[PDB]
């Protein structure tokens, strides 16, 4: 039959706390959405950028099903453009959201007579979440000017807090389970092309006066323009122009969507790492390309423009981290890395280290330890296959 696993998603005994919202991927299957609509007594079943009666006649490129519990009166916040605790600090949908938002009352499952305090929400944060960001941090929130140094008290607060789900509760203070299906619509308008069907700011990117450090890599979106891929090749003397997922001679001919240009600086012998399935200091902890990557990596020696007599220590890299980066993740944190079992309490010493370090770039240095400005062009291939469909197709 090959039906989609909405049993796993909707029927699960265990549901996530909104702050640590769960994501399941849905692909290579056939979803009967009207079976879904009758499957339970939903309180909210709404869709954005797509008609819910026409769901069975549609096919999508990507699908994700996100799962969590929030209060009844917080369900309002699981739409685009909204604000409040949940939208701002826990789960944010983008303004161009294409998908559906399903919810139902959960009070029989998720209440208890004493109270169920196992479901949590982030209360304080330094800034609002970007769309589809997830923050699982449990670090002490600093309300004032003094540091907290690992100890709670005044102006020093735990950032999470639990919902109190009683049975004898108002309906707006009762628990609600929420599924959020996110689609990518199959037929996708092309935004960047060569001679087929004014110019893209490739001079702006490749000849910027200032380039960013590798840990804080800089993404610029390229869209609604003509890509001069022939003229780029042999614009300057590039040491690298290796391309993945598409041929390096047919760039003009080709047409794609959702183009991005990621620019940064690394050592020469580290250029190797800017490519799929690679590991090392940079690929593990600074900039990671996915295995299924579709794009072009362009890099040039920069020794005349970046180095200087004393050195250029402005270009940093992340040295220590708790885990490897996910593909296309950026980490800008400057929190003390804890090497041991004792906490660090905002003071550096043994087992308590600053995670960044400067690349040393004096002009005397060999080719291995020289600066290389790297631009990574990231494409989305036009007319991608469908992955999830309805019975009617």
């Amino acid at each position: 039959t090959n039906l989609c696993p909405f049993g796993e998603v909707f029927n699960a005994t265990r549901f996530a706390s909104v702050y640590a919202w769960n994501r399941k991927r849905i692909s290579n299957c056939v979803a009967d959405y009207s079976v879904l609509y009758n499957s339970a007594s939903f309180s909210t079943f709404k869709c954005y950028g797509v008609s819910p009666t026409k769901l069975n006649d549609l096919c999508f490129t990507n699908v994700y099903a996100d799962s969590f519990v929030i209060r009844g009166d917080e369900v309002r916040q699981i739409a685009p453009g909204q604000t409040g605790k949940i939208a701002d600090y826990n789960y944010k949908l983008p303004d161009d959201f294409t998908g559906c938002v399903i919810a139902w009352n959960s009070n029989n499952l998720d209440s208890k007579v004493g109270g169920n305090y196992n479901y949590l929400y982030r209360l304080f944060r330094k800034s609002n979440l970007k769309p589809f960001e997830r923050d699982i941090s449990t670090e002490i929130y600093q309300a004032g000017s003094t540091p907290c140094n690992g100890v709670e008290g005044f102006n020093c607060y735990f950032p999470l807090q639990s919902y109190g789900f009683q049975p004898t509760n108002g309906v707006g203070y009762q628990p609600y389970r929420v599924v959020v299906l996110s689609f990518e619509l199959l037929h996708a308008p092309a935004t960047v092309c060569g001679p087929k069907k004014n110019l893209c700011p490739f001079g702006e990117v490749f000849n910027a006066t200032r380039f960013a450090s590798v840990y804080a890599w800089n993404r610029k979106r390229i869209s609604n323009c003509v890509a001069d891929y022939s003229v780029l090749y042999n614009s300057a003397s590039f040491s690298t122009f290796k391309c993945y997922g598409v041929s390096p001679t047919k760039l003009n001919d080709l047409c794609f969507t959702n183009v991005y240009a990621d620019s940064f600086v690394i050592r020469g012998d580290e250029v190797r790492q800017i490519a799929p399935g690679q590991t090392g200091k940079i690929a593990d902890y600074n900039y990671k390309l996915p295995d299924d990557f579709t794009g072009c990596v362009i890099a040039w020696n920069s020794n005349n423009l970046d180095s200087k007599v004393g050195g250029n220590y402005n270009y940093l890299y992340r040295l220590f981290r708790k885990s490897n980066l996910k593909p296309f993740e950026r980490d800008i944190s400057t929190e003390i890395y804890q090497a041991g079992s004792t906490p660090c309490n905002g003071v550096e010493g043994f087992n308590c280290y600053f995670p960044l370090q400067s690349y040393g770039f004096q002009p005397t240095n060999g080719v291995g330890y020289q600066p290389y400005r790297v631009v990574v062009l990231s494409f989305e291939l036009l007319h991608a296959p469908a992955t999830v469909c309805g019975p009617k197709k």
């Epitope: 220590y313 040295l319 929190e335 003390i336 905002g346 003071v347 550096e348 280290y353 960044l356 400067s358």
Partner: nanobody, 128 residues
Framework: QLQLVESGGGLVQAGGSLRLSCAAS????????MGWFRQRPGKEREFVAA????????FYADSVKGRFTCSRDNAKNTGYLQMNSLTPEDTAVYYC?????????????????????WGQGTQVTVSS
């Protein structure tokens, strides 16, 4: 060209406190740390304390641990050093300094060779 201007020194009774400021006039380099060094009468400059210019982390010499504390205000591009529980041993000439280079371990910031720019220095005096 980076200038560092110190203020807040002087004379103080033993047990008393004192707050140094070290105002910078440029935002060229946003890396490394701001360190403080003391020059005791008839002795070589020794490291006291430092705060990162990249982040919030601090570190201190064993002589001042728990008595001294440094912070910084980004808005005023100024570093501070709160000096509590002063003794006549702490009597010295205090200097601030920026090292532009960013090391992961604090080890190198204990040495004065690492620092590029320096302040004029201020006299702290503690009564016996």
């Amino acid at each position: 060209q980076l200038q560092l201007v110190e203020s807040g020194g002087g004379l103080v009774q033993a047990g008393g406190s004192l707050r140094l400021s070290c105002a910078a006039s440029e935002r060229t380099f946003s890396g490394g740390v701001m360190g403080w060094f003391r020059q005791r009468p008839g002795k070589e400059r020794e490291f006291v304390a430092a705060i990162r210019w990249n982040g919030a982390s601090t570190f201190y010499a064993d002589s001042v641990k728990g008595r001294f504390t440094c912070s910084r205000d980004n808005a005023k591009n100024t570093g501070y050093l709160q000096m509590n529980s002063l003794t006549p041993e702490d009597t010295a000439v205090y200097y601030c300094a920026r090292a532009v280079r960013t090391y992961a371990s604090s080890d190198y910031y204990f040495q004065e060779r690492t620092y590029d720019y320096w302040g004029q220095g201020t006299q702290v005096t503690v009564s016996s």
